[PDB]
Write an enzyme that holds these catalytic residues in place. Structure first.
Site, PDB file in Angstrom:
ATOM      1  N   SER A  91      -0.427   4.152   2.726  1.00 38.25           N
ATOM      2  CA  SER A  91      -0.272   4.017   3.949  1.00 38.25           C
ATOM      3  C   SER A  91       1.143   3.590   4.345  1.00 38.25           C
ATOM      4  CB  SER A  91      -1.127   3.109   4.851  1.00 38.25           C
ATOM      5  OG  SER A  91      -0.686   1.608   4.404  1.00 38.25           O
ATOM      6  N   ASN A 122       2.352   1.927   7.683  1.00 35.98           N
ATOM      7  CA  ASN A 122       2.511   0.807   8.501  1.00 35.98           C
ATOM      8  C   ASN A 122       2.564  -0.524   8.073  1.00 35.98           C
ATOM      9  OD1 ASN A 122       1.267   3.168  10.283  1.00 35.98           O
ATOM     10  ND2 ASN A 122       2.372   1.824  11.965  1.00 35.98           N
ATOM     11  N   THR A 158      -5.688   0.854  -3.800  1.00 40.10           N
ATOM     12  CA  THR A 158      -7.099   0.846  -4.528  1.00 40.10           C
ATOM     13  C   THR A 158      -7.069   0.687  -5.869  1.00 40.10           C
ATOM     14  OG1 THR A 158      -9.457   1.987  -4.842  1.00 40.10           O
ATOM     15  CG2 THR A 158      -7.274   3.347  -4.702  1.00 40.10           C
ATOM     16  N   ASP A 170      -1.961   5.648  -5.330  1.00 40.71           N
ATOM     17  CA  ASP A 170      -2.341   4.870  -4.295  1.00 40.71           C
ATOM     18  C   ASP A 170      -2.689   3.436  -4.911  1.00 40.71           C
ATOM     19  OD1 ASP A 170      -3.264   3.505  -2.206  1.00 40.71           O
ATOM     20  OD2 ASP A 170      -4.673   4.883  -1.277  1.00 40.71           O
ATOM     21  N   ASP A 222       0.803  -1.187   0.016  1.00 38.31           N
ATOM     22  CA  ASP A 222      -0.003   0.086   0.007  1.00 38.31           C
ATOM     23  C   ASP A 222       0.790   1.268   0.127  1.00 38.31           C
ATOM     24  OD1 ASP A 222      -2.303   1.614   0.196  1.00 38.31           O
ATOM     25  OD2 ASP A 222      -2.468   1.341   2.472  1.00 38.31           O
ATOM     26  N   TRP A 231       1.300  -4.488   9.541  1.00 41.01           N
ATOM     27  CA  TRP A 231       0.550  -5.172  10.619  1.00 41.01           C
ATOM     28  C   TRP A 231       0.105  -6.418  10.194  1.00 41.01           C
ATOM     29  CZ3 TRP A 231      -4.252  -6.582  10.235  1.00 41.01           C
ATOM     30  CH2 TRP A 231      -5.161  -6.042   9.066  1.00 41.01           C
TER      31      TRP A 231
END
Lengths: 370, 370
Positions: free
Chosen positions: B79, B81, B262, B259, B76, B83
Site C-alpha cells: 500500500s 498511504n 502479509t 508484500d 506495508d 494513516w
C-alpha cells in the site's frame, strides 16, 4: 384488548453523553433528522446507521421463535421493517444485546433474501427469515423479519433497544418485507385494521401500544379524525403553529409526520432557532439545548392547529425534565429544498394527545389524554 | 545506517481466534485477499476495512508531531498511504489504541482535504494533515498523512497495530497523498532512493526496515536484480513454481507481488488447494489450515524460479510454528478473470530472502539471508 406495554428508558443520546462519547461524534458528523424521511437528505458519512434513534425513549418487548427468544424493540411509526441482531453479528456493538439464534427455534425458516436496512445514515445488512413473533400475547405466525449481521455502528452498544418494529405503510418497507401490523391484519389476528398509542405522563408505566382497538379510558372529549395526506409515513396536514397568538411557522399550512421513534418536536432549522431563543434554551458542551427548570412557568404554550382544532402544548409538555436537568423538546432539521415545510410530531406531542392510526380508512385520530 | 526495528507479534487473526470472534465473521463474509490488489475484486460487504491485515505479523514504531506521539504501524509494501487513528475516532474499536491529538502538536497543519482509504473491503474516512514524522531517527518534515475518524470495523480493536505506513509507488496512493519514502527522498533525507527489509528467523528480534541502504551483513552470495514488471505494487515476473521437480503452478511464467503486509504465500485457489492436500494441511473450526508439527521433515521444498535463479522454500520456512501448533503458510485468492495468474510473496518468502526495493532503477534485489 391486545396491549403492548411500553417502558420509558434513558435514550441512546443520554447513554452516549454519560459515556463521554457524544462530543466526538458531533465534531465529525452533521446530524440531520430529515435523513430518516428523505432519500435526498441521506448522510454524507453513513458509519452510524442508528443515528436517527438518538432520542427514542419508549420501548416494548417481543418474543421470536419456538420457544420464544425475547428482544427489546422500538415500536416505530416512522419505519416499516422488523429486524433484530443475528447471533452471527460478531461486532463489538452487538455485545450485551439479545441476539436471535435461528438454530434454537423449531419454527424458523431461512430465506436467501438479503436485507439492506437504512434509516438515511448508513446501512446494515443481514438476511430475511420467517418465524412466529409473539406481540402483545398474539402469535404472529409466518412473519418475515430481518436478521442483522454486519457492523451496526458503535451506537448499538449504548442503545437501550435490540431492534426495531416498524408501524408505517408497506410502501416504505425495505426489500418489500411485510410489516408486522399488515401480517396481523392479513391473518385476522386483530379486531380492526387500526392501532392506538397511549403514553403515560412523567415516565410513568401505563404506556401501551393497543393493537386492533381504541380505548375511551385514555382520552377525554371526542376524537378528531384527520386524513393521511401522503401514504408512506403517518403524514397529515398542519394548518399553522402559533406562540403567544403569533404565527411562528407553518404559515398557510404544512405537513407533519407522527413519529413514535423520536421524543422531540422537529422542524425547520430557522423556525426552531427562533423558538429556542424565545424559551431561553442554550446548547451545552454535549449536544443539548438546556433550559432552567425554574423558568418553566414563565413560558408560553405553542399551539398546533390541525384540521381546525387547536392542540396546545404547555411548557411542562415541551420541556423534558430529567431530575433538576431540563432540556428543550425541540430539534431542528434541513429537508430537501425540493420539499415543503415539514414538522415531526414525536413523544412530546403524543404524550398529550392519545393517537389513533387507522389503516382501514387512512386517517389519524387525536384527543387529549385522560 | 537508518534502521527501523520490526517486532514480530501475534496477528489480528490469532487475536480474533483467541477471542472466539473469527468463526462468526467467516460465516457471514467471504475473505478474498485479491481484493487488496484489484478494484474489481473489492468485497461485497465492506464492513471490516482492515480484513486484508488479518495475517500481518511484523510491526514498527513511528512518532508524529512536536513533541512526538508514538504509534505502532505496519510497514506495508502492498500500500502507499500513511494513516493513524484521530483522537476524534469515537468508535469502540478505537479504544485501547494510540490516537493522534492535533492540538498536542505545535507543528501540525490541518487541511480540509478528506481522506478515503480502502484496501478493497470497505472504507475509512478522515482528513489529511501535515506534521513531522519521526521514522528511524529521521525527522520527516512536512509529511502529509491521514487522520482516521470513522468506524474502522471491530477488527481494529483486536489489531496489534494503530495504523499503516505504505511503501509502494505513489500511483496507488489514495487522494494522491505523497508516500513517506517519496517525501524522504524528495527532501534528501536518505542516502539513496532504495530501502531493504531483513526479517530475522524464528520471531527473533533483529528484523529491520533499512531506509536508503543495502547491508551485506544480512545476506550471503550476490544479489539477483529483477525488474519491476508493473509499477504500482512491487510486482515482478515469476518463471515457474515446482514441487518435487514437478511444475505445480505458474507454468509459462506469471506475476508476483512482494508484500510485507502479509505473512503468507497467496496464490490461485486451485493451485493452493493442491498444495494443501500435498502437505497434509486441514482446515480447523477456526479459519486455519493446520499441519502436524511432527511431519515437517517429510515434506518437500517448493521452488520459485525468478529471472532464472532458483529460490527454494523448505518446509520449516513455509510452515508457521506457534509452539506445538503449526499452520500452513499458504493461502488462496480469486483474482479478476481478466487478470493472469498472480502470487503474493509475503513474510514466509522474505524471511528467507533479504529483499531490496530500488525506486531509482525500479528493480527488486534478492539474496539468501545470512
Amino acid at each position: 384488548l391486545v396491549k403492548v406495554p411500553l417502558v420509558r428508558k434513558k435514550s441512546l443520546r443520554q447513554n452516549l453523553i454519560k459515556d463521554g462519547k457524544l462530543k466526538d461524534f458531533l465534531k465529525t458528523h452533521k446530524h440531520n433528522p430529515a435523513s430518516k424521511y428523505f432519500p435526498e437528505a441521506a448522510a454524507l458519512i453513513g458509519d452510524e446507521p442508528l443515528e436517527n434513534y438518538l432520542d427514542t425513549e419508549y420501548f416494548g418487548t417481543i418474543g421470536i421463535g419456538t420457544p420464544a427468544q425475547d428482544f427489546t424493540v422500538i415500536f416505530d411509526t416512522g419505519s416499516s421493517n422488523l429486524w433484530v441482531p443475528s447471533v452471527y453479528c460478531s461486532s463489538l456493538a452487538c455485545s450485551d444485546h439479545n441476539q436471535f439464534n435461528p438454530d434454537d427455534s423449531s419454527t424458523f425458516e431461512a430465506t436467501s433474501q438479503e436485507l439492506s436496512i437504512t434509516y438515511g445514515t448508513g446501512s446494515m445488512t443481514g438476511i430475511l427469515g420467517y418465524d412466529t413473533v409473539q406481540v402483545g400475547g398474539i402469535s404472529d405466525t409466518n412473519q418475515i423479519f430481518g436478521l442483522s449481521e454486519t457492523e451496526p455502528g458503535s451506537f448499538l452498544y449504548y442503545a437501550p433497544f435490540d431492534g426495531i418494529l416498524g408501524l408505517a405503510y408497506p410502501s416504505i418497507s425495505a426489500s418489500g418485507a411485510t410489516p408486522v401490523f399488515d401480517n396481523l391484519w392479513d391473518q385476522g389476528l386483530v379486531s380492526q385494521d387500526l392501532f392506538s398509542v397511549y403514553l403515560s405522563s412523567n415516565d410513568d408505566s401505563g404506556s401501551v401500544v393497543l393493537l386492533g382497538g381504541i380505548d375511551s379510558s385514555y382520552y377525554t372529549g371526542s376524537l378528531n379524525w384527520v386524513p393521511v395526506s401522503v401514504e408512506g409515513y403517518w403524514q397529515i396536514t398542519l394548518d399553522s403553529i402559533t406562540m403567544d397568538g403569533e404565527t411562528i411557522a407553518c404559515s398557510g399550512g404544512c405537513q407533519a409526520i407522527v413519529d413514535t421513534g423520536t421524543s422531540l418536536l422537529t422542524g425547520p432549522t430557522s423556525a426552531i432557532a427562533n423558538i429556542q431563543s424565545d424559551i431561553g434554551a442554550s446548547e451545552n458542551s454535549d449536544g443539548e439545548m438546556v433550559i432552567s427548570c425554574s423558568s418553566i412557568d414563565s413560558l408560553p404554550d405553542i399551539v398546533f392547529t390541525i384540521d381546525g382544532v387547536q392542540y396546545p402544548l404547555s411548557p411542562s409538555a415541551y420541556i423534558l425534565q430529567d431530575d433538576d436537568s431540563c432540556t428543550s423538546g425541540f430539534e431542528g432539521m434541513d429537508v430537501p429544498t425540493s420539499s415543503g415545510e415539514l414538522w415531526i410530531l414525536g413523544d412530546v406531542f403524543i404524550r398529550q394527545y392519545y393517537t389513533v392510526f387507522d389503516r382501514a380508512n387512512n386517517k389519524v385520530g387525536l384527543a387529549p389524554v385522560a
